[PDB]
Symmetry: D2
Subunit: 217 residues, 4 copies
């Protein structure tokens, strides 16, 4: 395969949140077969970001997912050609984000071209007031729909004041060639900001993801 | 505990779907600490049901969930007084159900009084055309909200033609006495109709549920 | 037809809101061709109701709508056989209600058999804390879907401290015989509680409703 | 007033739908106090557009709304400084769009900078299969929320062969400076494509919009 034990990542995101423009670039590396990865992200335009950086992090590649032998791996099979994805993020207080990403591979390095746009966040809500601490770990439900792979996941941001703030993700993952389609299955995730500086101009970001069937008979 | 290794279940559900009235009664048993249970369900009014039986099954008790010792068990803690739950089920084609249940305990038997109402199902959709095969297994996200326990789950019905039909559950679980609240956690489920007669006047239904933290290591 | 200029109403609602059971019976009258009606409602069980009465009022009959002659009147055409409706009410804070009504006619009097169930209202929200003042007037968008009539309306409750609390209605209206179906149109409403007693055991309720096309002219050459 | 009886319009939209990039430029004119306007739109990049042009048209300025004297006009009051808006468009089959516009005034001419992104449209649905005929006329519900103006509208596209395809709009309108805020009210609209060429590289577009209270005593 062109997917090796260790692979590098480069990316650029451009976007808006509540009309505020920004650009972020990143570089990282990961272990596609272990489902782990780390990257460093740098704000290039739009500092200081006026919103919770956490809304961005899941937009910064299901290639980095440990897939068991008995579940077809839609993402790794898609290379060398690659894949794109499209996502809606519906927050419980009316905020809506769309995001798209085009994922290509050159040599040992993936490149992501990412667009992110967020609208209708309440001005005193947790996103515009930067009151989030982290996403909780999650379980994404993966199923085929109209020839492509869909993923839906109930996400939750733990808040400073205590309690959680909910967001529902719907993602369409689109391979650029024929791949073996998996049956309905699950991808468990844990994403974390490992470190960051004031105003999140520099962020180190980590994700662990593992695919599985039900644990139950 | 008043909750023993083996417990019985008695229930009654009254409801409507697409304006069609029905009553179902049930009796069963399970193992609260294993997270398993089986029951037999009988349609008493409204036979033959004109909609997919699968929309009802998850309304027919989180007491039947294996909880590890390091996650507080909101449900078992609530007894003998017990608890109620409230649920919305939002289907991707505009169909919406509400369901409520009040769960009490007398001796070795739980009793559920269930209400179920479904509206705005498309006439040619998989519910009214009875084109569902089963629910997929699931993972429900449990979290405290305004002093009680909430659960959200992305559910999917596998269809006869292949492909899936999606529904989003939001449930509030309300203990009738103060209990130790758990941190954010997960409940994995598998619900299965084991057997049924031609028009689902008789149904044997099984659920296995286990609570957990993330399977992924911390850091 | 069997729809007269003055007609009577009787009803019974049974329901729950956040698990609290109640029963309400009503009697009233209205003018089907004017789109106006008034009724008196009495709590029979569940008093004092622990939630905002306003969430129930739109459940307490589109026969009471003034329809111009050039828009087919789905509702009046459905009698004598009648019709039923099904509704979801999705509030912006996660509260959700379902409501169903079977509407029959005997002599000069309609009877409505109504079910109403509301779940997941936040305990400190405006519904459970009774902080609503009224519904704003509205415009419902009416369109045929799969052989029956659907109505979607963006509704808003005016709140005590100022500001609004939003709810989206989707209603399916189902005639019990074949009727002439209308093109896409609008129904304007204003529903108001005219009077009530302390705990809303006795409520007098009014609705005015008028159907129309767009007020804006069609494009021409 | 800097808002005159006749005013001009110039705009640029950049965006994506289903991952497909495009750029459209427009010029027009209208009558702010009468609530009418017409414009000509040209596809600059991304031709031929692979999706229903109708999804774009409501993104191409509530300044063009007839306002009665007894309802504060949030939009005309915002000039000369101007205003922005943010919108989510939630279609009944899972397609979701975000759009944002920044609206400025130079001389007799309004300038819009528009971004539009649409995701998760089903490949055989009416948007990707171009089965839409027009938007129906509508009534938008306008209300203050957290100090800015919100508009929610139930929209419907008339489809080929009959029937409708529904979309729910939520828009936040944000004046750059403080303006007198209006009570709950309504804006009626009718938007129409007057003419277009093969693949909609050139489109002439019209809207009429009038604000009002309820017609019922
Ligand atoms: Mg407000």
């Amino acid at each position: 395969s062109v997917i090796k034990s260790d692979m590098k990542i480069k990316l650029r995101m451009e976007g808006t949140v509540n009309g505020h423009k920004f650009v972020i670039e990143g570089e990282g590396e990961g272990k596609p077969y272990e489902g782990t990865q780390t990257m460093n992200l740098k704000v290039k335009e739009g500092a200081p970001l006026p919103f919770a950086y956490d809304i961005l992090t899941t937009a910064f590649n299901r290639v980095f997912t440990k897939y068991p032998k008995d579940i077809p791996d839609y993402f790794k099979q898609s290379f060398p050609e690659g894949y794109s994805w499209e996502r809606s993020m519906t927050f419980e207080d009316g905020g809506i984000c769309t995001a798209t990403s085009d994922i290509t591979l050159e040599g040992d390095c993936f490149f992501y071209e990412i667009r992110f746009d967020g609208v209708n966040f309440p001005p005193n809500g947790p996103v515009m007031q930067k009151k989030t601490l982290k996403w909780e770990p999650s379980t994404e439900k993966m199923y085929v729909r109209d020839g492509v792979l869909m993923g839906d996941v109930n996400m939750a941001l733990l808040l400073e004041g205590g309690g959680h703030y909910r967001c529902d993700f719907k993602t369409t993952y689109k391979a650029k060639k024929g791949v073996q389609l998996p049956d309905y299955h699950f991808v468990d995730h844990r994403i974390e900001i490992l470190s960051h500086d004031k105003d999140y101009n520099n962020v180190k970001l980590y994700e662990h993801a593992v695919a599985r069937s039900s644990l139950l008979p």
